Amino acid sequence: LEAIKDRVLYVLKLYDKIDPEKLSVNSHFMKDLGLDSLDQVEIIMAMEDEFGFEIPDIDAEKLMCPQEIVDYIADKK
Amino acid sequence: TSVKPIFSRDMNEAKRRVRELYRAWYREVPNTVHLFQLDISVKQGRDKVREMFMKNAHVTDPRVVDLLVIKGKMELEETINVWKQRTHIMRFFHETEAPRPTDFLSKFYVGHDP
Amino acid sequence: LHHALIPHGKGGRSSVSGIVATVFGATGFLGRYVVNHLGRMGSQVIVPYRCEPYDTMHLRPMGDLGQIIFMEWNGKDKDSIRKVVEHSNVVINLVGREWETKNFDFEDVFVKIPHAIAQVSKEAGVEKLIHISHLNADIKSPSRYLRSKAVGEKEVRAAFPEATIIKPSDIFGREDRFLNYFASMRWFGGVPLISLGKETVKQPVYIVDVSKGIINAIKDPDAKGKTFAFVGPNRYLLFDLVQYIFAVAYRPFLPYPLPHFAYRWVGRLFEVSPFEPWTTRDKVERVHMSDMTLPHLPGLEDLGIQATPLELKAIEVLRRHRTYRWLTSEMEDVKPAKTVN
Amino acid sequence: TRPTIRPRNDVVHKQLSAFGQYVAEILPKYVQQVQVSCFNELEIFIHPDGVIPVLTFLRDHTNAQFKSLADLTAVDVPTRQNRFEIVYNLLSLRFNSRIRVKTYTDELTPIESSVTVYKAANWYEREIWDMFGVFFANHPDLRRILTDYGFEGHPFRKDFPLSGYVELRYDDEVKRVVAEPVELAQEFRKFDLNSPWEAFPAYRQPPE
Amino acid sequence: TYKFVNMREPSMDMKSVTDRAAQTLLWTELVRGLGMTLSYLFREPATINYPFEKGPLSPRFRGEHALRRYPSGEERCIACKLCEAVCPAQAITIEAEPRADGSRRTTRYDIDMTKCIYCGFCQEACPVDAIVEGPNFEFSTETHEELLYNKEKLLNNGDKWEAEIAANIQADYLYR
Amino acid sequence: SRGEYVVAKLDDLVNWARRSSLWPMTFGLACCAVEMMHMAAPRYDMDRFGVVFRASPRQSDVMIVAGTLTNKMAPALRKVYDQMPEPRYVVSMGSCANGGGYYHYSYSVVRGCDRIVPVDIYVPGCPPTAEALLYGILQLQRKIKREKRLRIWYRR
């Protein structure tokens, strides 16, 4: 899980709008980071390209936090 | 009641359709740049897609949202099949339009425009 | 202003901008871009041509009906100059060739013709004169091109005190000499450079930026008798610039140092062509010369134009020089070249 | 013998009236009105959702074999609430007759596609969409047919200007055709032609 | 009544079978086509020697426009704008004012020959036979601007073609 | 002088070949194209003058823009014109190609092919008769006759 979290944090830090300083594993995209739905969709697409699998729209709604993202990724192995 | 909806009924499913269309467009800008030999960047294309999506952010009627996503999907399928040329894709960018000022003083200077 | 010169419309193709401009030497790179911009504004344009009328066909679609008028003129004919500048309130001077012909030399095309145009323009009472010079216009430059450029600039300033003298650094574009000259050295095996090109610094300027600066200079009220230096945003060493050009063109890059006297001899050999030479001794001198820094002169940012970097528009020019293997390659693939700042 | 005036066909008028009564009786759920014009053209006005049942009946019924779809168009009437007026023209070869079916809709309400009844309805409904904006629900391939690629707006709406909003030209700076806002050299001269005197008292609208 | 274009079945007697087989082997219909082409070769061509020979026309032909005059020299147009109102393409622009002698004439009369559809409605709507569609049809140009005629150009055309226009009007006006 | 005489003879020879051999591209959009067929017809045979249709733009010298140039068609016309190699000439035919024609005030019509391509000859009419089109072709030929590329180059 450490590798998954490291990869997810590295991918998130490449996003321009997201500040690496304020980014944290438990930071809410909408609330803590102040983003909207489209930016979350772009992040989910970036994760899809990263870990090489498809995240449906239903599974793309329950990924508002990096902790939730890594938990979902580990869930799908 | 009794009002026929185009698709998706309430607003949440319409937003889901909007997100699906945005994903489809987002995963198409690199292919559009590669195929059409555009001089723009992929990041510029994604920014323009975001801008064209955001210029309808005030719509609150689900039927209008469904019609907008239908037209967007039509335009997306025109681009993938290369039915459009480089001309239309660059028409999306207004690369030759003169900058119309929006300040009152300049508008007064140039002409009688409101 | 006359009643026919009052601006009208929303600045479109069929509008009236109140600008009547005679564009000397409009059958060229900067000439065609400036004429296109004027026609897009919707101005009256007079294009004096001495070549075949076929070579001036591409200028017809650049303006609405009755906006582009073609007249025949001779360089050493003040009567023709007066005929073509009689009814225009703006005169734009872009005449210039990079080589010396049998009839016209650097002295003729850069001193006598610009001075005659300025003198006749003053007689006809034109309101604005724009004259194109070079950034490296030195009175004692190693290049006769730059010597004559400086002499003609002084003569034009003397003849027409209310002139605007533009000094672009180096124009790169689709029909340019710069990028095409550097990228056409694929045929001659390797790329010869003087001292490997480590001593030359250049900051080229975009053709569209130069044209927009010329256009805004006309519309700027307080640029009547000024001097402007049009330069790009980033300064490049010549070696890095050529390396980036070849990287974008996706061609093998084999630079080797060629001594200055040998390069001068090679340029002497290539200027014997009766047609347009591939390169000349003065062209070699201009390539070797670094771009002078003139911070006291105003520029594109002062006129109101943001300089366009080379990396953004380098693929419009160099995509033609690629092969079928690399034709579809994107712009982001090649990293930007190192700068000197 | 009144050579100027066109002759009239009472027999065909009566036949069309009888058939209109017949179809109205057979399909009362959707048929709202039946008219016979003075030049013997049967016309049926139905509810918008009855398109498929009414067309299938008129196509496959033994007494009404309208197997050929003559035309399919729409009329934009801005004053009406349901501005768009979908019109079907049908031809019966067996009985050597024609019929017209008219439904109503607006910009947002979809009309069920009749491609499952007539195959020409594919391109006809594509044209209707491209020209007016009427969306057809179940269509094999719905997209623009006549307008330019990426064209915005529907031209045949009565609120669409004649000259459009944009024009095309070749810009040498970008080495490609560009689209710019319309700017006519000579403005289209609108003519007020209607006379201020009533022409036909037979069509006089009551002052309520 | 109706007829079947292709419903004739072939015969099956031995003579016809042998004839069809000979046609299949020996290309009889191909030789017939060759013979027809050879006959057309040996005929006379129907090509005229333009421009030394001009194709036939009719007095009703509608070509280059013109403005006519009365025999006294006065213009025929009275600025009634019927041609402008009836022009399908709106290629005519007319502006008028009272003349110095009070006559109702035209100050601006413009025809855009690049917008005209050459339909003849202007000459049929003219109540004084002022505007006419003359016989000239060879007036091509190297520039767009010269195809935007005005009053002076149309009067010059009328003066140049007055004789032929008058002859055509005389020959055709009884049918109008 | 001798050089002037030589260049005059050479560029009179070169212009003669282009004048006497014209290969219009097979390109007709609307009703004006029928008059192109009637010019190709035996009555006014254009092959008599050395004018013969060729299909590919690469093997064509003259583009006879005959028809209405719509917005959906303009890019294709520009592309084929660009693909047509130099020297190239353009003959606008009919009112639609000249200006707007009957459809001047329309949302989907380009008013004049000269907005897209440099036009050398304008042939008026709706449609221009076969004689008018032939006269336009002959006028284009005579326009090519007075070109002096070598004479301009010699004095250049």
Ligand SMILES: CCCCCCCC/C=C\CCCCCCCC(=O)OC[C@H](COP(=O)(O)OCCN)OC(=O)CCCCCCC/C=C\CCCCCCCC
């Ligand atoms: C010196 C040069 C001579 C030039 C001759 C010019 C002939 C006319 C030129 C015009 C012809 C050019 C176009 C021809 C193209 C089409 C020709 C063609 O199709 O022929 C093939 C046609 C069959 O094709 P289809 O009928 O279309 O098959 C499909 C059936 N539904 O017939 C043929 O196969 C031709 C074969 C040649 C016939 C040979 C018959 C001779 C046999 C008898 C010889 C006996 C010798 C031995 C016996 C000795 C006894 C002692």
Ligand SMILES: NC(=O)C1=CN([C@@H]2O[C@H](COP(=O)(O)OP(=O)(O)OC[C@H]3O[C@@H](n4cnc5c(N)ncnc54)[C@H](OP(=O)(O)O)[C@@H]3O)[C@@H](O)[C@H]2O)C=CC1
């Ligand atoms: N591009 C560059 O490298 C830079 C250029 N400049 C200056 O900008 C100006 C425009 O440059 P550019 O477009 O590249 O040059 P071009 O060679 O492309 O254009 C020169 C123009 O002048 C005409 N001309 C040349 N000689 C004569 C003559 N003897 N008499 C009359 N007309 C003549 C040519 O017409 P024709 O074909 O009929 O002979 C042509 O239209 C020049 O003054 C140049 O010095 C400044 C900085 C950089």
Ligand SMILES: *P(=O)(O)OCC(C)(C)[C@H](O)C(=O)NCCC(=O)NCCSC(=O)CCCCCCCCCCCCC
């Ligand atoms: P989050 O879900 O909180 O926020 C969603 C947004 C911001 C969209 C709004 O909150 C929202 O959903 N608003 C409701 C109104 C609405 O539906 N807006 C979106 C309409 S869909 C739409 O407009 C699609 C248009 C098609 C896109 C055109 C493509 C243009 C790009 C051309 C290519 C150029 C480069 C290749």
Ligand code: SF4
């Ligand atoms: S011939 Fe027809 S289109 Fe031409 S000017 Fe006359 S009325 Fe107008």
Ligand code: SF4
């Ligand atoms: S119809 Fe005849 S008289 Fe009337 S305005 Fe036209 S040309 Fe003049």
Ligand code: SF4
């Ligand atoms: S000018 Fe007339 S004949 Fe020619 S394409 Fe247009 S409508 Fe057809």
